[PDB]
Design a protein around this nucleic acid. Sequence first.
DNA 1: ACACACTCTCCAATTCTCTAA
Lengths: 92, 665, 169, 50, 261
Amino acid sequence: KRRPQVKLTAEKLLSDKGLPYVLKNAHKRIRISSKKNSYDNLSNIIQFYQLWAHELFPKAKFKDFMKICQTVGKTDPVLREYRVSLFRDEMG
Amino acid sequence: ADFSLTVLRARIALLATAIGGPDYTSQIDPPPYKLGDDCLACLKDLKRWFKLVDDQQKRWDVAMAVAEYRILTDDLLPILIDWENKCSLAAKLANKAYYDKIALNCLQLLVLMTWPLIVTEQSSSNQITLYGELKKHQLVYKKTILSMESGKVLRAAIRLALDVIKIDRLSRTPRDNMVLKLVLNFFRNVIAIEPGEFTINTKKSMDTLPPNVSMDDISLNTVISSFHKNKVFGFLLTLTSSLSKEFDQDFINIPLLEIMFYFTKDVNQELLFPRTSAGFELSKLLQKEHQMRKNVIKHTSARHSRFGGLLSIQTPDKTRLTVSGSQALVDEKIALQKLDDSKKWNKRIIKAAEGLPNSLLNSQTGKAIFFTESNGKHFKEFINNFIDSGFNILLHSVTNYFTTEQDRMVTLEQVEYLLFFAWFVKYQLLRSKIDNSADIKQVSEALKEVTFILVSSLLRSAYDLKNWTVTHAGMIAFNELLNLVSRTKAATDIEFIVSRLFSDERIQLLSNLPKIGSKYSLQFMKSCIELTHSVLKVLEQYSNFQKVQANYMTEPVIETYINFLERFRELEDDSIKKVFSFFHRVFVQAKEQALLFRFDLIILLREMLSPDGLDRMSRSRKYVSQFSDYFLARLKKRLKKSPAWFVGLLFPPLHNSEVGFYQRY
Amino acid sequence: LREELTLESLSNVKANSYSEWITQPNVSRTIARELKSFLLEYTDETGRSVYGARIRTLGEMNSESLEVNYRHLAESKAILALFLAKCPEEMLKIFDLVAMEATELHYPDYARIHSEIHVRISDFPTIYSLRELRESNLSSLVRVTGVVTRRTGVFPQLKYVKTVYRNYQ
Amino acid sequence: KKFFSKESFLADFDDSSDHNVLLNTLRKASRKQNPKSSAFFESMVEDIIE
Amino acid sequence: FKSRALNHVKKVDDVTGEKVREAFEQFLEDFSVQSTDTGEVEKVYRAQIEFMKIYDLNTIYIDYQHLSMRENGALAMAISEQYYRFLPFLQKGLRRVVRKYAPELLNTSPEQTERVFQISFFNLPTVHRIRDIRSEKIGSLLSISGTVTRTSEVRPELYKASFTCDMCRAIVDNVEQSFKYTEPTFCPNPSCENRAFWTLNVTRSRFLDWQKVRIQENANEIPTGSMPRTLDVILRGDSVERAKPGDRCKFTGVEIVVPDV
DNA sequence: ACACACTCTCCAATTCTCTAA
Ligand SMILES: [Zn+2]
């Protein structure tokens, strides 16, 4: 056979390298200010998400990363279990 | 066989000379043509070659033969023009029947050869083979017919009509009424022939104007000039306006719909109203060009393309990247963008309409067609007199036909009716917006109950069977009716009509419609948006409302709005005003903030708001920056109150009962 | 196929170009009949048919080239002269195939002496130097004058692409 | 309001109100222009006679 | 069969080109200078078109001063700085006017092919030396002077081409050349796939006259301790063989860049 | 034999459609 293709998958997201890093650091990473423009602060938010997306899975263009995430995010039950777990933690 | 084929071609060629010829005694250098004999039989047998053979075998070979021997250009036009000019001189003074017989039968061939072309999966392989070439030859026909003596054959065709206008309807035999259908059937073709559409067999993934044809020969501009000099517009105007008085409506009023479609098609109404001028706007446009040049310059290095050094960028966790070029040294935004731009893949992509001639339904209409001044004023005069004279009487007849015949319809007649309605109603609204001499009463037949039912029924039936082109046109017609209603309410029965228009069944349909738009072409989504804006604005001025607005707000509508909004480089200044009006409605008024916290919206506002996209001084930036400020304020508040939304922002919202309620609020 | 045009019918070029009109079978047959009718019939003022007298001497010298004066061809059947000036490469093929019929009328079995005859045109009524030639002259017949500066040796060349050859220089 | 009646239109429809040298030479000549072939056969038969 | 139309074909269009086209149109119509002797409008460019009709000419001469004073000079600027972009639009503008007033000129008996008009300009503001040609001015409108040193013989250049397939009876027409001899990409009849063995139809294709000439700097202008530079110039249409070796001439046109074919 | 241009082929990745809980 030819070599099988490599893809983004929920296992990467649920890995310790994955989504927990964002929740462990996002409060410290991003910072808005009224003292800078909308365009300024708006640009700032995307920085962290871009660098994190590269570190996670360098295949593809940033937009493609988001739009790929939509499919697995809506379909996989284990990922959804993790997400309802987050919002239960806030219900705790 | 090939020899049988060429035998028929030769038979035709001999018939192409038995017909007659000019006179070489004449010493008149040249004279006109001169007439043969058996020629009745010649014309009749040619008619048989079309009907009894080519139609029965479904070929178009016979047409190829007559095009080879140039019959139209060479004999038919001078036979007719000589008949016309002879009878004209006789009328100036103020067997002959046989001459008139020849005039009739030449015209009927002109209709046949210039008849427009249709291709399907049931057309013969012969026709499919010959489609592209006969298109070229019909283009030649259009140019020629408009050119001869500055178009004088068109006076022959209407003189034929004038014989049958002449004497009382009470006398007029069925054979007699066919002449009055035939003449109008001619002008439809002459307007309808236009440059070809390229078509190929999809076996492998890898212009059609002939050398004697050019655009100015073929443009709609030309056709206006040609008809005006040759006295057509008076005929269409007189004939349509006295239509109610006992001309048998049945024979005329569909052909006479198709004309009005076939040259309203490809005009934007604003081009007919102005709202050194050309030079002034050209200079202003050059300023815009300079701004684009400035944008390129701001991304251009001072020193040359091989001077460039190398750059390294270190992340958190001490890992490093490499990028080249001299601007990357100073601009991190550019370095970040340039870094991702190298990467190869793009996800491959998905794609609604076929079978009908180019129109608003499947072309970008931000592209005018162009008028001489005399043409501009003559065209404005023709349709203005049409509206003030003919429109109500025409619509009343054609609509009370179609209610009795809806089941039998074909896709084209549906798309004609819905794009004749739309054009004339909009143009009148614009004309009276401009000036007080105009009035809205002229188009007022559209509102009465029967037509409202019929536009509704077309939209209904088209939607259920998933016919998306009729659904698209019906969307355009139903938009205008609503627009006209809000006009008239800004001045009795109209409220009754509203209440019936906004029964619950229809709200289910009109709410449903933007949701499916996400898949389809850029026009479809634009129709959905403009209809939605109108639909909500009427019900705002009804004063029910809270039921209806909550019906609209959900994920699959928002998806369509963003998917449309990100192609803003192609769209108008006005449409973006409409989209942000809706976001103001979702975000501030309804206070359903949770819909828009989704990441591909946040990307969009950077692109569009950057020095990249929307101009620093267009009115759009007022709205956009005033929106984003408020957006990010509310987002700040939400994120600090509940940190889980950092992982929320990537994904759709979560539809579980126990956690989802707190999630959304 | 069977029917033929009149000479007056050829006054109107009916196709989109000259070459595509000459090459049609009925037109070509008409031109062939007319050229043969000219060659068998043209006269001096004294009668004394010149081409019947030239074909006679063609065999007396066992020759291969028949010579035709352009002024004679322009003095009657003028349209053929016009077509010759416009499309020589077609017209000369037809004219050569007529000249063989005319020579065999004097000398049957001349085909055993030479298989094919060439018509040579003389006294073409307009002249250029090597200055006045332009792109409009392409594929037209021209008449030119000058000094011969250099000449190659003679070689054989393959005629058709069993084999046949011809001389070249 | 307009009307554009029939009877007006019928009434108003009617009442309203160098090869350049050689080519011309040959065209005009073309427009202007068995016993006949006997001279040819006579030239052929003179070989028999002389 | 899997027949399919190019439903997506609707093209992108340059608004500046169309506006320049129909502004140059108005200049040709109504420049409306008064008579040399009297205060009466003369309309010289319409008269020049009529003159061309009288003598079957193919070139028109325009004065840059007349264009400079038109519509606050923006049109002249667009023509001057971006000639290579806008030259086709100027041609389209002139074709319509000649159609309007002298349709006998549009053609060059069987059918007659279209006349290839040539626009020409003179009386530009300043003349450059061969030594002043610099890559920043590529594609602009200029005027130059020097002494002629060589000239080539006149050659036919292929302008528009037309081909026919060997394996099937099919024809391709109006193929566009630029700098190298160029041929079709597919057989247009889908019953055949052969790309080879095209032949150029010399009757249906169209050519132009072309001549190369070579010039060098004026001797009295050479700077201190230096030697004269040279340049190659292209002449086309009704201006071939006008130049003579050893003479002094003034030229105008646009400078271009030619590849390694 | 050593880089190239071009052709051919198979296989699995992807999206679309139907069914039942
Ligand atoms: Zn082929």
